[PDB]
Ligand binder design. Structure first.
Ligand SMILES: CCCCCCCNC(=O)OC[C@@H]1O[C@H](OC)[C@H](O)[C@@H](O)[C@H]1O
Lengths: 268, 14
């Protein structure tokens, strides 16, 4: 079947629970891709549902700031999710290297992220796991576009209907409603956007603790601040957008659509 | 003091 006869495998790009991500070449086309290779030998019925869900969600999303799924190939004992190759690496690595982004660069960055999240939300997809590791740069040329990646934890929602969809995400980026084990939906992504925007502007996260129990307490109480000296030169309107994203009550939290109309984004 | 660190994803509670 198609992958084994048409594609050649090269170096590893990442790891998963029962998957690797490897660079591959479609040999006759001379085009390179990133292949998520899932070992499907004795997968549970639910694990088969989640693989199909990831494939369906990735096929659904067509956006300049979302990684394109090229193909979904089922072979004996192996499934291949074939994505466009993205060579700029994690947004995470670029923030660490540059320490922080200027407000102009941070605004441009979060604008692209919010456009990607807006599209997801319009198509009834909640990512649930937004973070700098899951945002890739299109090239190594500075000012390259950001691409939302890894919909392995993504869920399908029916309009604005919210529910307990289970405990999933990354500690530092988890919304209060997920940590309380309360019903949630699209707003969990805007909370994560708030954490990412905070990181962009000063190069460290708003919530952090060696003790995970204290981390979760600080998140649930929205106990973040803007310490000196890094926040001393940051505009009030940057702090305002962060505040509206890092709103504990998900009803009153800014939406993707609203965030894109905020003066700090739109007047620029 | 808060640090930018790579963190692992969960699909159930710790
Ligand atoms: C994780 C399943 C989706 C794979 C999407 C591949 C997109 N193309 C793609 O070329 O991914 C590149 C690498 O892929 C991983 O991140 C997704 C590495 O952690 C990163 O170092 C990143 O550079």
């Amino acid at each position: 079947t198609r992958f084994t006869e048409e594609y050649q495998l090269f170096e590893e790009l990442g790891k998963g629970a029962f998957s690797v991500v490897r660079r591959c070449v479609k040999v006759l086309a001379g085009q390179e891709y990133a292949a998520k290779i899932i070992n499907t030998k004795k997968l549970s019925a639910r694990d088969h549902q989640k693989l199909e869900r990831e494939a369906r969600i990735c096929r659904l999303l067509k956006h300049p700031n979302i990684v394109r799924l090229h193909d979904s190939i089922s072979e004996e004992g192996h499934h291949y999710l074939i994505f466009d190759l993205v060579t700029g690496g994690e947004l995470f690595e670029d923030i660490v290297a540059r320490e922080y982004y200027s407000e102009a660069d941070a605004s441009h960055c979060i604008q692209q992220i919010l456009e990607a999240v807006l599209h997801c939300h319009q198509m009834g997809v909640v990512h649930r796991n937004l973070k700098p590791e899951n945002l890739l740069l299109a090239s190594k040329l500075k000012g390259a576009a950001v691409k939302l990646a890894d919909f392995g934890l993504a869920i399908e929602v029916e309009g604005e209907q919210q529910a307990w969809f289970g405990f999933a995400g990354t500690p530092g980026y988890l919304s209060p409603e997920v940590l309380r084990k309360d019903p949630y939906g699209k707003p969990v992504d805007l909370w994560a956007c708030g954490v990412i925007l905070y990181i962009l502007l000063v190069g460290y996260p708003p919530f952090w603790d060696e003790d995970q129990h204290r981390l979760y307490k600080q998140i649930k109480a929205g106990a973040y601040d803007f310490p000196s000296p890094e926040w001393d030169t940051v505009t009030p309107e940057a702090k305002d957008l962060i505040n509206k994203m890092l709103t504990i009550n998900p009803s009153k939290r800014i939406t993707a659509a609203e965030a894109l109309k905020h003066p700090w984004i739109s007047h620029r | 003091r808060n640090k930018l660190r790579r963190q692992h994803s969960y699909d159930t509670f710790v």
